[PDB]
Amino acid sequence: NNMFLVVALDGGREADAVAVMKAAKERGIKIILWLAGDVERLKRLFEKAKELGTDIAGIILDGAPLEKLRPVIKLAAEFGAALFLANMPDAATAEEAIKIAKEEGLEVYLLADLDNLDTVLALAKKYGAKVIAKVDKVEDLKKIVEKVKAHGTDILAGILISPLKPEMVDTLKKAIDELPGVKTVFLSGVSANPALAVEVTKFLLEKGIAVGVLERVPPEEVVALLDAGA
Amino acid sequence: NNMFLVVALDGGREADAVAVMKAAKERGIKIILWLAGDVERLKRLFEKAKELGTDIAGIILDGAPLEKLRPVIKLAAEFGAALFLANMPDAATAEEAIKIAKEEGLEVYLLADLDNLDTVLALAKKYGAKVIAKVDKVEDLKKIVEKVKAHGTDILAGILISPLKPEMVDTLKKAIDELPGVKTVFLSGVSANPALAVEVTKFLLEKGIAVGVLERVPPEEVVALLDAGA
Amino acid sequence: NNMFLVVALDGGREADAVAVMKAAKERGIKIILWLAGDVERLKRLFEKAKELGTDIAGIILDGAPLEKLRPVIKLAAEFGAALFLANMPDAATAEEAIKIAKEEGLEVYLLADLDNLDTVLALAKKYGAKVIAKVDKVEDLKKIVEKVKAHGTDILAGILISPLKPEMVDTLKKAIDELPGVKTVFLSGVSANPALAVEVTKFLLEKGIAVGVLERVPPEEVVALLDAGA
Amino acid sequence: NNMFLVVALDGGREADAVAVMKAAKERGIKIILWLAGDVERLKRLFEKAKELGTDIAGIILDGAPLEKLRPVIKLAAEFGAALFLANMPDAATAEEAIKIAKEEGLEVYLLADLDNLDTVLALAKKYGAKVIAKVDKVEDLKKIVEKVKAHGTDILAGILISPLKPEMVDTLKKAIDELPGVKTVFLSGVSANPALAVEVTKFLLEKGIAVGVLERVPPEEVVALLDAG
């Protein structure tokens, strides 16, 4: 019965970020933090989500430089969050980030679109991390299914479809049937066709797959979305 | 368990409407026809749904005049579709429509907003029809649960929330808990906040409630939405 | 510097349809009717639009068979509305509709997508009708300019972009520069990216091109959109 | 006329932010940066926008503390960007921010919703800054027009309507007729009804007012929005 909400809580007033976390806890929504650089705010968010009990399921380092990796990875370890790595600057920073995260006993997810899926798969076997595939074209999804069957379906834990196109719906259904490792599929809570979103949510829940909503807008907009102005 | 798709299949090319019915049957989506007056197209569509195996779960008369009721009601009875009545011109035209449909042994759903909800609950009791409540204001949910507990909770089978606003979410979550009769909830497939739509779909499916998607645009647009050009 | 609103005024409570026309007149919006078959309601809408002063700029026959062409065209001639023809069953029915419409002295626009653009340009050349080119693929745009230049830049009066996709924007800007005949561009008022809609509207208004908004949803929804519960 | 695009370029891969700025320049769109804390990335964005010719018209400090004000203000002054202030932590942080920005010769716009409009109006005249009003309820507009006429329509340079609801459209039109200081109106480029968006853009341009589109989503999403892959 899990629903994730990917939020970007490093901007705006911190009271808004905290209102997002409280409202999520109240609505049974697990939170993934998308990071924009503020590690002090990160530590305060970890503390206050503990106080509130909000489940910070994970944090995402997206294009983060090497000097920022270690404090973030240490905070994740202290508070028991999964680490997602995305758009890593170069192969050495990515390798270092996985190495330190595994040294800290972290659950590590590596995001990959088709272009560097092979690369990411390699790292995922080398350190024992899972992969989340990023699809924006139906063709990319078929190719990813091929490559993942060839490298083992239990390495792919999630799929992200940010432009959910009508022509993707059926292909995604079939892909999921061939990918028993996929635990979460992520859709845009901001710009996805509501009818396709309802249909795909229905399909995912029936298959026992969790739904993740991407909401990486300033926390003020999310406080409005969750009616958390109290 | 079920997903309904309310479509407006009058207008434009009939091959597009059939492509819609084909795509729905393939995707496990039950179809409700929103009628605009065309009784020949209604009969042709019923025939092709017979032919293809498509389930036409229901038909909607919206602001329908008296001269058009009987041919439509006869078609619904012949092919086994539920009759939804909305925005009936005056209480007598509604009376005639319910009476004729019940002479045909039809499932009758009466849409109602709050201001004339009481009337419709009464009428539904007079003829053994169910009611679908229209919510566009959070206070309406409290008032509706009241009036429905007053007239018996088994008379309310559905809720339609066409502007699904953030502040309604939690109130809806509870109101459904106080309305064990509600078997279907309807959302806009065109303009609903996708994040709220995902959350509300998850909640409904977990409660064993069906989701209906309002998609009353020309059939060519629905053909694009279901990627049904093939 | 005009704004058109393409509306589907059949199938409502009809008081909603007049409410739509009233609000459009108030707000400086020209109305184009998309027809779904009900010729009596068409007659009443023309009558009350006369009473209110509302400008029904045009009406759209979308997939009409031969027997429906003449009564509709009679109404268009009687009240002075331009005729848009789309999805004609065959070139012979299309010819019949254009022929009758010209015998009544109507302004005629022929909608065409890429596959049968040339044919429609030919017909428009034969009868002095204008063409509206339908875009759903970025590649189409260059081809349209090709096909239009072979027949003359004044024959194409409009463009319709039903899914306005990000890659189309710049290509559309240049294509519009290559086609001085374009007097109107049509966007989806329902499912267009608002940022892309703002940009393209700005570009058009700077070039003195009118904007058309497709809003072929039930008239109750258009009443909600224009807040016309007067 | 001008079109603004408020983007959140702190986060994700920096070349995505560069791709956004290049596409903006190519498409004739002025950029307003919504800041999330990364001041080194801010300096590099300023540098790259120089290189490309992109106009960084403005930057937004949203709930920023006092110690982050001065370096950000220095970047704005050095590169010629207006300073936007919103959701300031306390009245003193706001006072100091306006003080420092004016000491460096900066154009300062202060955001206010109805609830702290008067306060912000005061501050704006005390230091010579303009105000941008935030509207999310049709009722808020009557009250704002009142307060602004009482304090002078030359103080109101902008309006932001993030939930642009149908009932607001006509009221907004009427308020705009009474607010000749309004040079920019800001809409949500993400979740605003497209038909209403077109109507309002048409009306604003006819009155010579610029449109600002809010797109504070991560830069890969904005790179997708433009065709800058």
Number of H helices, E strands in chain C: 9, 9
Residue A206 CB neighbours (<10 A): 10
Across the interface, whether the CB atoms of D190 and A14 are under 8 A apart is answered no
Residue D62 CB neighbours (<10 A): 22
From the CA of B125, how many Å to the nearest CA of chain C? 25
- In chain C, which residue's Cα lies nearest the Cα of B16? C63
Contacts for B73 with CB less than 8 Å, ≥ 6 apart: B83, B97, B100, B101, B104, B106
3-class state of residue B83 by DSSP:
strand
Q: Which residues pair with C4 in a beta bridge?
A: C30, C212
Q: Which of A185, A193, A199 to probe the B interface (max B CBs under 10 A)? A: A199
From the CA of B59, how many Å to the nearest CA of chain A? 20
Chains in contact with chain A (at least 3 beta-carbon pairs closer than 8 A):
B, D
User: Residue B38: its chain C contacts at CB < 8 A?
Assistant: 36-38
Q: Which residues pair with D185 in a beta bridge?
A: D159, D211
Q: Which of B32, B165, B186, B201 to probe the A interface (max A CBs under 10 A)? A: B201
Contacts for A58 with CB less than 8 Å, ≥ 6 apart: A32, A33, A81, A82, A83, A84, A107, A109
As given in the structure block, the two tokens for residue A51 are: 């106080």
3-class state of residue D81 by DSSP:
coil
Contact between residue C216 and residue C192 where contact means Cβ atoms under 8 Å apart: no
Contacts for D94 with CB less than 8 Å, ≥ 6 apart: D85, D88, D110, D123
3-class state of residue A51 by DSSP:
helix
What's the angle, vertex CA C81, arms to CA C76 and CA C84, rounded to 5?
85
Q: What is the dihedral of CA B86, B92, B96, B101, to 10 degrees?
A: 30
Phi, psi of D109 (to 5 degrees): -115, 130
DSSP states along C176-210: HHT-TT--EEEEETTTS-HHHHHHHHHHHHHTT-E
From the CA of C161, how many Å to the nearest CA of chain B? 12
The distance in angstroms from the start CA to the end CA of chain C is 26
Give the residue carrying structure tokens 């190519």. Answer: D26
What's the angle, vertex CA D63, arms to CA D60 and CA D69, rounded to 5?
65
User: Residue B205: its chain A contacts at CB < 8 A?
Assistant: 201-202, 205-206
As given in the structure block, the two tokens for residue D90 are: 């306390």
3-class state of residue B131 by DSSP:
strand
Resolution of the experimental structure, in angstroms: 2.7
From the CA of B212, how many Å to the nearest CA of chain A? 9
Across the interface, whether the CB atoms of B194 and A187 are under 8 A apart is answered yes
As given in the structure block, the two tokens for residue A73 are: 């990875």
CA dist D129 to B21, D97, D110, D133, Å?
A: 60, 11, 7, 13
Domains of chain B: 3-225 (3.20.20.220)
Across the interface, whether the CB atoms of C166 and D190 are under 8 A apart is answered no
Is B3 an interface residue toward A (CB < 8 Å)? yes
Contacts for B204 with CB less than 8 Å, ≥ 6 apart: B176, B185, B210, B211
The distance in angstroms from the start CA to the end CA of chain B is 27
Is D215 an interface residue toward A (CB < 8 Å)? no
Q: Which of D162, D211, D202 is nearest to D182 (CA)?
A: D211
Across the interface, whether the CB atoms of C1 and D215 are under 8 A apart is answered no
User: Residue D7: its chain C contacts at CB < 8 A?
Assistant: none
Is B191 an interface residue toward A (CB < 8 Å)? yes
Q: Which residues pair with A82 in a beta bridge?
A: A58
Q: Which residues pair with D112 in a beta bridge?
A: D133
Is A199 an interface residue toward B (CB < 8 Å)? yes
Contacts for A73 with CB less than 8 Å, ≥ 6 apart: A83, A97, A100, A101, A104, A106
DSSP states along A177-222: HT-TT--EEEEETTTS-HHHHHHHHHHHHHTT-EEEEEE-S-HHHH
Chains in contact with chain D (at least 3 beta-carbon pairs closer than 8 A):
A, C
Across the interface, whether the CB atoms of D36 and A10 are under 8 A apart is answered yes
User: Residue C167: its chain D contacts at CB < 8 A?
Assistant: 227
> A104: part of which helix (H) or strand (E)?
none
DSSP states along C37-104: S-HHHHHHHHHHHHHHT--EEEEEEES--HHHHHHHHHHHHHHT-EEEEES-SSHHHHHHHHHHHHHT
Contacts for D51 with CB less than 8 Å, ≥ 6 apart: none
Question: Which among C166, C190, C225 has the least Cβ separation from residue D227?
Answer: C166
Distance CA C34, CA C27 (A): 20
Question: Which among B10, B41, B63 has the least Cβ separation from residue C13?
Answer: B63
Amino acid at C228: A
Question: Which among B12, B36, B190 has the least Cβ separation from residue C11?
Answer: B36
Distance CA D28, CA D219 (A): 18
Contacts for D27 with CB less than 8 Å, ≥ 6 apart: C169, C170, C199, D226
Contacts for B9 with CB less than 8 Å, ≥ 6 apart: B17, B20, B21, B33, B34, B41, B45, B219
3-class state of residue C14 by DSSP:
coil
From the CA of C138, how many Å to the nearest CA of chain D? 12
Amino acid at D145: V
Task: Report DSSP state, residue A28.
Answer: T
Contact between residue A37 and residue D14 where contact means Cβ atoms under 8 Å apart: no
Across the interface, whether the CB atoms of B218 and C218 are under 8 A apart is answered no
Q: Is B24 exposed, middle or buried (0-12, 13-18, 19+ CB in 10 A)?
A: buried
Across the interface, whether the CB atoms of C8 and B62 are under 8 A apart is answered no
